[PDB]
Design a protein around this nucleic acid. Structure first.
Ligand SMILES: [Mg+2]
Ligand SMILES: [Mg+2]
Ligand SMILES: [Mg+2]
Ligand SMILES: [Mg+2]
Ligand SMILES: [Mg+2]
Ligand SMILES: [Mg+2]
Ligand SMILES: [Mg+2]
Ligand SMILES: [Mg+2]
Ligand SMILES: [Mg+2]
Ligand SMILES: [Mg+2]
Ligand SMILES: [Mg+2]
Ligand SMILES: [Mg+2]
Ligand SMILES: [Mg+2]
Ligand SMILES: [Mg+2]
Ligand SMILES: [Mg+2]
Ligand SMILES: [Mg+2]
Lengths: 88, 54, 24, 55, 361, 53, 110, 49, 159, 42
RNA sequence: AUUAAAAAGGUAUUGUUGCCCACCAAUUUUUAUAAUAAAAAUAACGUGCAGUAAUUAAUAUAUUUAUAAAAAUAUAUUUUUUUUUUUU
RNA sequence: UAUACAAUUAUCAUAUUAAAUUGUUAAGUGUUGAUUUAACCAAUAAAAAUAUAAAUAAUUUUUAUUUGUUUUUAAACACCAUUAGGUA
């Protein structure tokens, strides 16, 4: 069945399954791209990445994304969590 | 703003296209200067260290 | 219900709001 | 409180007294004190065109 | 199919939806439980007459000319030429008074400008909310006793009447916002107050408000119980206008009062001053009365022309007096209410009456 | 968060008085992912205030 | 709502107890409510209120001679026309007709 | 304010569609979004980027 | 302004763009309203590809700004006219232009209480600033204020 | 005790309790308010 | 040359070998008799192991499910134990 | 058997001066395939973002109105059953 992109089963690989959207160049992700890093000449992409990832992690975005994109939680438990977080 | 801008196609549904340009306007606070008001506990202890070692 | 205490449980704490509810 | 009036508990007595309390009496605003609920939602489905002899 | 059957499975919180179904869209009640499917032709006409536009009555141009003839003389010189001094200000005492163009712009201030501007501030360009405020200001002006008057019963009544109509048609379109159901009902209650105060202030404006906006439905006493206790009339006692009438212009006061030393009623002193205060009669009363007046002509003619039938009936009455329950007229026999004063007879001894009370007391 | 319950209550109170002093702790019913665009005319396409059910 | 939220007094703690109900007590009464509701479910209870009848007096429909669960107890006396109609209502409630609003179904409803 | 009347419509529309005509002697005006958009010639083909 | 629009349109051959804008203009004039400005902009590259009537996604589109004076009743008609036209990809509507966000909050307006005629007289451009605006207009503005304020009465009291 | 009688925080001023009693039944009988409609004490 | 000190709950009450939960027999007693009436006393037998943050945290409403405690889902919630970016 | 609640703050069911209601957007095809799960089984997978001002306070709405149950799957996720479907 139709899944969202952050869904578990989203991009499937099976005999039936096929990926949705124009997948290269100007793509399905066209204006949906959260970050863009032009790689400076003679710069390993491992620094690029670890900077991106540190960024998301310290601002608790990767937190949020991981959280909401795995399982469902009712608006009450979600409130309880965000407010508990904020109060701590 | 972001809502309108998006539905007119003048802003992306994700991401910040001005992220770098916008860095001027943000108070980037150098680890070398000290602002007495921070919730940064690292910077404080850093300058403590610096002066003690001095 | 069961009309009697199955558990003999005596908590000894006397929180002031439980007692004087006129003032708190 | 004599124990034989109204129910076998005490609070039943004071609950009947509330039908005699002065500031609680029935009027044009507070009505149907004793059965409110038998009359509730009684005319919801009763459609009555209001009365106009004047244009 | 026959009557609504609710069906409730007791483990479930609430019953199943009943029977051949209640009408799919819930009825819209007024404050008293009466139902309106839609606005009346008259109200409808009021909304159509608000929608397409409104106008200041030249009533105001007139009184502006007769009150301040100098200013109207100046404007009379200056027509079409652009003005830098607003001579017309007396004509519009209040911000609210100028409704013909948006943002309270008096007409003659528009003289020397572009006609695009003239079309930009015109009625057609108003929002709906603005247009309501237009209808409201014009009416408030018609019934106001001075310019800055709001609080007065007449003005209040009209503004509330309008607001009520608006909310009504609103609910006609988009069915469930119960916020506005409630606001409508509250407005209606406050309208009820304003009107019932009006008819004791002056009743003709009261009348023609009811005839203009067609609210007679919220003046209808809600239910028989509270009406019978005289708490519908009790209202204007509370509002304090209960004695306000100032008789002498209407209803000459001489025959309204009883005699204190004589003890004769007002019907009496009226009789003696040779006056008749008698409310207009419907058909019932005229007919009963006219049938009563003539008992003696009928009787006279009867006993003259036909002594036999008469004499038979008389035999009946006469012998009857000697038969029957009581012959004697004492405190017992002469109890005006027999079942009431002896209730203690009613089950066992006396079988005539099933109940101890047939009247107020 | 429950230690701050009084605070939260203050806001529930507010959302109730906006509703004519009625529905306490009530919230708008969640709808559907496609709520607006799958529903025909005459049916509510967006979640209402709870008193406005 | 018609039915009762609770059975017995579920908020009984000392004054100023800063909750409607303690865990213990609410658990007891959840037991009570549980037993009652289970009794209603297994005995296949049915009630009705009819238009133009005293409402607070509810005909026991689960006790009618047709719909009765027991093969022994004498059920109840309800007028032949009204009984036929009640039977037709209970019967036509069961299944989902397309276009009607979906309403929750159970074994015990039938 | 210059209001477009009904008589002046297409004249104005066309004066506007020719704002960026892909050649001129003078500096070009920007957007409301503050961009220099594609210069199209007569008939709206995408000539200068 | 009373109303505004941003109209994202498919970049067609000019006769078609002229036709379409004439359709919309005639759809405004019919309904008894005015046009303050119909502003043209170029063919831009948006952040979102748009699909037109053919469901063929579009990388480029022409932007066109509308500023109108209507009633709010039959702008409903104008609106469902506009959104239903095949060559209008998107339309965003601004109804807030008479009372924008920045005014009438806790006596923020000096010498008056919400004078409405300020933001009506105005066009959209000066209510909502475009990115390129810099400190330079701070000069231009006043050379256009002082100047205006000098000649207004003289010019108005002529006729 | 949610289910049970309200208790005063402190006592009631007895003096004040006697001051509120002026119009009570006994003082009324002594004023002669109620009508004597029956034989009464012998 | 790799690590370790500091924050925590109990329906029990010398305390988890602690206590409790429902069905499943007899009986006792009141009644407003719904598969097999309801409710209250109760000390057998047999099934489990529901609860005490308690072996998928609990509590309330809602709907469903059922040898028996109860279990699944939808909401609210802590009488459950906390983990904490003032533009990076 | 009779013999003196509270009235300054008390959590389960008798509400009441309130500004809402209405918005048509998004997403979809290249190719030969072990995705999700602690673990099973059916089997295209992508997606649905915009509104403030304003509505005057109280006095007869309590048979009136009102407190998360909702047409359309030929649209999915999700949930329930297990390859047949239900529901959404
Ligand atoms: Mg399917
Ligand atoms: Mg104990
Ligand atoms: Mg303890
Ligand atoms: Mg008598
Ligand atoms: Mg008798
Ligand atoms: Mg017995
Ligand atoms: Mg029993
Ligand atoms: Mg459990
Ligand atoms: Mg256990
Ligand atoms: Mg557990
Ligand atoms: Mg539970
Ligand atoms: Mg339950
Ligand atoms: Mg079980
Ligand atoms: Mg349960
Ligand atoms: Mg109560
Ligand atoms: Mg459906």
């Amino acid at each position: 069945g139709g899944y969202m992109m952050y869904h578990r089963k989203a991009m499937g690989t099976m005999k039936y399954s096929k990926w949705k959207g124009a997948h290269g160049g100007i793509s399905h992700f066209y204006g949906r791209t959260p970050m863009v890093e032009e790689v400076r000449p003679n710069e390993p992409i491992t620094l690029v990445d670890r900077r991106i990832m540190h960024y998301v992690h310290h601002s608790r975005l990767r937190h949020f994304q991981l959280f909401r994109s795995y399982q469902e939680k009712s608006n009450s438990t979600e409130c309880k969590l965000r407010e508990g977080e904020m109060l701590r | 703003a972001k809502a309108q801008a998006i539905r007119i196609g003048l802003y992306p549904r994700f991401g910040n296209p001005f992220w770098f340009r916008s860095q001027k306007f943000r108070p980037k606070a150098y680890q070398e200067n000290y602002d007495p008001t921070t919730y940064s506990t690292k910077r404080t202890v850093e300058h403590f260290a610096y002066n003690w070692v001095q | 219900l069961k009309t009697l205490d199955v558990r003999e449980y005596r908590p000894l704490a006397m929180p002031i709001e439980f007692r004087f509810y006129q003032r708190y | 409180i004599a124990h034989w009036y109204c129910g076998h508990k005490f609070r039943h007595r004071f609950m009947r007294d509330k039908r005699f309390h002065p500031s609680l009496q029935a009027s044009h605003d507070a009505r149907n004190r004793f059965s409110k609920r038998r009359h509730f939602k009684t005319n919801r489905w009763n459609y009555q065109q209001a009365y106009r002899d004047m244009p | 199919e026959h009557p609504a059957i609710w069906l409730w499975y007791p483990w479930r919180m609430n019953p199943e939806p009943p029977t051949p179904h209640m009408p799919q869209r819930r009825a819209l009640k007024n404050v008293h439980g009466a139902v309106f499917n839609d606005l009346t032709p008259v109200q409808k006409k009021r909304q159509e007459q608000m929608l397409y536009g409104v106008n200041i009555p030249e009533t105001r141009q007139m009184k502006f000319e007769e009150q301040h003839p100098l200013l109207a003389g100046a404007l009379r010189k200056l027509e079409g030429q652009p003005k830098g001094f607003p001579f017309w200000y007396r004509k519009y005492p209040t911000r609210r008074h100028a409704y013909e163009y948006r943002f309270s712009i008096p007409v003659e201030m528009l003289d020397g400008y572009n006609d695009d501007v003239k079309k930009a501030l015109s009625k057609g360009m108003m929002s709906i909310q603005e247009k309501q405020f237009a209808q409201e200001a014009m009416y408030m002006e018609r019934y106001a006793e001075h310019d800055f008057d709001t609080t007065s019963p007449a003005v209040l009544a009209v503004k509330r009447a309008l607001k009520c109509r608006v909310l009504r048609n609103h609910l006609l379109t988009n069915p469930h916002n119960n916020i506005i159901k409630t606001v409508l009902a509250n407005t209606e209650r406050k309208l009820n107050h304003a009107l019932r105060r009006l008819r004791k202030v002056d009743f003709k404006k009261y009348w023609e408000i009811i005839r203009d906006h067609d609210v007679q439905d919220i003046l209808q006493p809600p239910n028989l119980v509270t009406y019978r206790q005289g708490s519908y009339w009790k209202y204007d006692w509370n509002a304090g206008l209960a004695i306000s009438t100032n008789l002498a212009d209407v209803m000459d006061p001489r025959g309204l009062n009883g005699c204190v030393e004589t003890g004769r009623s007002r019907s009496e002193v009226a009789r003696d001053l040779g006056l008749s205060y008698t409310r207009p009669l419907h058909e019932n009363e005229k007919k009963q009365l006219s049938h009563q007046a003539v008992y003696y002509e009928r009787l006279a003619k009867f006993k003259m022309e036909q002594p036999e039938a008469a004499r038979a009936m008389e035999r009946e009455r006469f012998v009857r007096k000697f038969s029957g329950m009581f012959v004697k007229m004492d405190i017992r026999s002469g109890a005006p209410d027999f079942p009431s004063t002896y209730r203690r007879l009613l089950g066992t001894k006396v079988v005539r009456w099933a109940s101890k009370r047939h009247g107020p007391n | 968060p429950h230690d701050w319950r009084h605070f939260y209550a203050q806001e529930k109170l507010v959302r109730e008085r906006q509703q004519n002093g009625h529905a306490y702790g009530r919230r708008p019913k969640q709808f559907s992912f496609g709520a607006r665009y799958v529903k025909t005319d005459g049916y509510g396409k967006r979640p209402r205030l709870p008193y406005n059910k | 709502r018609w039915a009762a939220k609770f059975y017995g007094q579920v908020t009984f703690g000392p004054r100023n107890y800063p909750y409607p109900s303690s865990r213990w007590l609410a658990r007891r009464f959840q037991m009570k409510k549980h037993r009652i509701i289970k009794r209603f479910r297994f005995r296949r209870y049915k009630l009705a209120a009819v238009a133009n009848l005293p409402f607070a007096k509810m005909i026991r429909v689960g006790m009618l001679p047709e719909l009765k669960s027991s093969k022994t107890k004498r059920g109840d006396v309800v007028d032949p026309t009204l009984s036929g109609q009640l039977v037709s209502a209970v019967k036509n409630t069961g299944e989902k007709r397309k276009g009607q609003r979906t309403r929750p179904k159970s074994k015990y409803q039938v | 304010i210059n209001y477009v009347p009904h008589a002046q419509l297409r004249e104005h529309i066309d004066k506007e569609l020719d704002k960026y005509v892909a050649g001129k002697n003078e500096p070009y005006p920007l957007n409301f979004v503050g961009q220099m958009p594609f210069l199209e010639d007569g008939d709206g083909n995408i000539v200068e980027v | 302004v009373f109303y505004s629009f941003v109209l994202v349109m498919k970049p067609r051959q000019r006769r078609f763009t002229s036709q379409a804008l004439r359709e919309i203009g005639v759809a405004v004039y019919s309904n008894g309203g005015l046009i303050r400005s119909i502003t043209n902009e170029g063919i831009m590259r948006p952040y979102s590809r748009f699909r037109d009537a053919d469901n063929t996604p579009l990388t480029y589109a022409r932007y066109i700004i509308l500023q109108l004076d209507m009633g709010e009743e039959e702008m409903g008609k104008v609106d469902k006219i506009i959104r239903e036209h095949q060559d209008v990809l998107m339309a965003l509507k601004l109804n807030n232009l008479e009372r924008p966000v920045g005014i009438r909050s806790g006596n923020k307006e000096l010498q008056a209480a919400y004078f409405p005629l300020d933001t009506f007289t105005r066009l959209e451009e000066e209510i909502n600033w475009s990115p390129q605006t810099s400190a330079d207009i701070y000069t231009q503005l006043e050379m256009n204020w002082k100047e205006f304020s000098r000649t207004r009465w003289s010019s108005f009291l002529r006729n | 005790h949610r289910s049970g009688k309200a208790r005063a925080f402190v006592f009631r001023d007895p003096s004040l309790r006697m001051m509120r009693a002026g119009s009570g039944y006994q003082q009324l009988r002594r004023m002669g308010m109620p009508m004597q409609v029956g034989m009464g004490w012998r």
